[PDB]
Ligand binder design. Structure first.
Ligand SMILES: C[C@H](N)C(=O)Nc1ccc2n[nH]c(-c3cccc(S(=O)(=O)N(C)C)c3)c2c1
Ligand SMILES: C[C@H](N)C(=O)Nc1ccc2n[nH]c(-c3cccc(S(=O)(=O)N(C)C)c3)c2c1
Ligand SMILES: Nc1ncnc2c1ncn2[C@@H]1O[C@H](CSCC[C@H](N)C(=O)O)[C@@H](O)[C@H]1O
Ligand SMILES: Nc1ncnc2c1ncn2[C@@H]1O[C@H](CSCC[C@H](N)C(=O)O)[C@@H](O)[C@H]1O
Lengths: 334, 335
């Protein structure tokens, strides 16, 4: 039920831990600070809607860039901590915390700018972008500023170092304890790779087996986008492996772009500094060995789950070299 | 919340590889049992063994290697199928017999000369598996029979969790990195991280320990009314004296278990010993208390099963810190 699903979802954000995690994410939090301060021209003297203000930090960054008024809308009980932070920084007169969903809140005026940190695992887990787009339609003036303004999604075949050690563990028992358990490699593979869950795990550049491929671009200003999101977003990809590796499946990640000076990009690439998002891993049922110039192709759609519209679903089709086309349907882990 | 529903959810954890990888990767735990079993070759060579919860079968195989003639590997989760294959692959399928199902209901062809079991949960008694080992002792161990391990001890000490101290202080550091003062959120963070009634499993070290650890219970597995003690709740009074000035966050408990020898082998989960998968079980007060050198800390702790889930550890804590009034807190193992 909606009532139950919202209450359960907002329960997460009424607790300190996820906000500690988000603000401790320097890459994420510095990116928004600099994205905002670099848009001082467009914000100074202007009104801002912060969609999902949480502890209020981004609304305060907007005030510090010289916005005349900032509506900090927060649906979870954390709105009380945002009010306390705004009062505590002496900005009660410039930042107004409004409890409740952005979909139903009443702003006194339309706004010149929206700022929101709406991105989930795999970019679209939690489906918060719908709330930002709802706010854009209803509260942003024609021509108004969107922070960030766009998002891009990337895919690449990976060999996951940590998964490889966990799979290989059972073959090393004999050397450690004088019992041969190498026969549980099959079992370990079914348990760790044969599930249909998206796995959130940080990779390094060494886990990446080809040139990453962009499979989608979301321009938040593009009319049509709400409908695209419920249809599902994605496309085809093609790439060539660098070398011999046990391929475990694919990583997807995203970046978002603030307008500038010059445009600031917040990346969640494994080639770039770690963020709380890590990457979203799509494991094959078992490893497939690949080689220099092995062709990996397929097609991916990100769409909301039927039973929970905040639950990211990934439909993957893929071909590794001369192995036949396969299909796998993933849902975000609990 | 039916018994058959609680059981199938519990055993579904053990039917998956992850827990068995974690346990076998725990060198301290796994070496202690290898060594504790092989050290006991005398009483095992040519003898019958019951392995209560054989899992992937590893301890059942240590016993065959120790020279046991017949080992019954009882395992209630679907992992018994993986144990059968491990035994087969190590060429031991005539000495080690994997029997599926709960030890409470399975049929051995005979009484056994030894029980071995790795029954220990977080805070020692989380999962309430000791009850199954004792059921099997009563029902299947011969008079004068051997138990591996033989005893367990519970320990308690006031702690100043350096990790929690960092997390509570985090909101005071926001102004320095980002130019926003969020120091006013310390109270909120304290309510969230300390104000709940969950036992937190977390690895401490000496720097976290505020006093001499106190033993608050000794479980001799051979002792008669132990099952009844477990139902009533095991525990006892404790008192200690703080080492220095510190924000006290609460208590850590841990356990060791002892195998008979050589000398007796002690598997310890103390924060002063090498790290295990069990770590320590943390009991936080609702908020920090400032203690000083020689600040007196005392109370009484009971460990017992929860009412709704009998496999869920509950801790009743009564404590007093200096001249603050006695307080009470009732903890249940985190899910
Ligand atoms: C949208 C925003 N920009 C964001 O980054 N949110 C974050 C940030 C940090 C998180 N740490 N863990 C989680 C998390 C953990 C478990 C479950 C879920 S959930 O089902 O999507 N949920 C919100 C209840 C989320 C985080 C979510
Ligand atoms: C008793 C045995 N000796 C042992 O050490 N068991 C272990 C060992 C490692 C574990 N890693 N995580 C868990 C764990 C994680 C979630 C839930 C639970 S549970 O409620 O107690 N349950 C079994 C369903 C347990 C472990 C249990
Ligand atoms: N439809 C909606 N209306 C209002 N707030 C929402 C919302 N959907 C999600 N939120 C809130 O949006 C927040 C996203 S997390 C980001 C919090 C804060 N802006 C920061 O950057 O640290 C959560 O607090 C969540 O409760
Ligand atoms: N009453 C019971 N009867 C049989 N098996 C049980 C049981 N209670 C718990 N178990 C099983 O006991 C095991 C304990 S943990 C794994 C122990 C394994 N012998 C090892 O040391 O690596 C789990 O596999 C669990 O499923």
């Amino acid at each position: 039920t909606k009532r139950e699903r919202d209450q359960l979802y907002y329960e997460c954000y009424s607790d300190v831990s996820v906000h500690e995690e988000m603000i401790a994410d320097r890459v994420r939090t510095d990116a928004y600070r600099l994205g905002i301060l670099r848009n001082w021209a467009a914000l100074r003297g202007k009104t801002v809607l912060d969609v999902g203000a949480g502890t209020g930090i981004l609304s305060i960054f907007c005030a510090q860039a010289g916005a005349r008024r900032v509506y900090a809308v927060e649906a979870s009980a954390i709105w009380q901590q945002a009010r306390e932070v705004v009062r505590f920084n002496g900005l009660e007169d410039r930042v107004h915390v409004l409890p409740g969903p952005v979909e139903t809140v009443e702003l006194p005026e339309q706004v010149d700018a929206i700022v929101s940190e709406w991105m989930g695992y795999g970019l679209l887990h939690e489906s918060m972008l719908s709330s930002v787009l709802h706010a854009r339609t209803k509260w942003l003036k024609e021509g108004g500023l969107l922070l960030p303004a766009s998002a891009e999604l990337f895919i690449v075949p990976i060999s996951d170092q940590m998964l490889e050690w966990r799979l290989g563990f059972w073959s090393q028992v004999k050397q450690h304890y004088g019992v041969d358990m190498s026969c549980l490699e099959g079992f370990a593979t079914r348990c760790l790779m044969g599930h249909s869950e998206i796995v959130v795990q940080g990779l390094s550049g060494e886990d990446v087996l080809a040139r990453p491929q962009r499979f989608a671009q979301l321009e938040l200003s593009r009319a049509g986008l709400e409908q695209e999101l419920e249809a599902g977003v994605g496309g085809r990809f093609r790439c060539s492996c660098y070398g011999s590796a046990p391929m475990h499946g694919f990583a997807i990640w995203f970046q978002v772009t603030f307008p500038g000076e010059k445009p600031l990009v917040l990346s969640t690439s494994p080639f770039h500094p770690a963020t709380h998002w890590k990457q979203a891993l799509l494991y094959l049922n078992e490893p497939v060995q690949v080689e220099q110039d092995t062709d990996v192709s397929g097609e991916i759609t990100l769409l909301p789950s039927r039973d929970n519209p905040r639950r990211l679903r990934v439909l993957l089709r893929y071909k590794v070299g001369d192995q036949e086309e396969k299909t796998k349907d993933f849902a975000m882990e609990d």
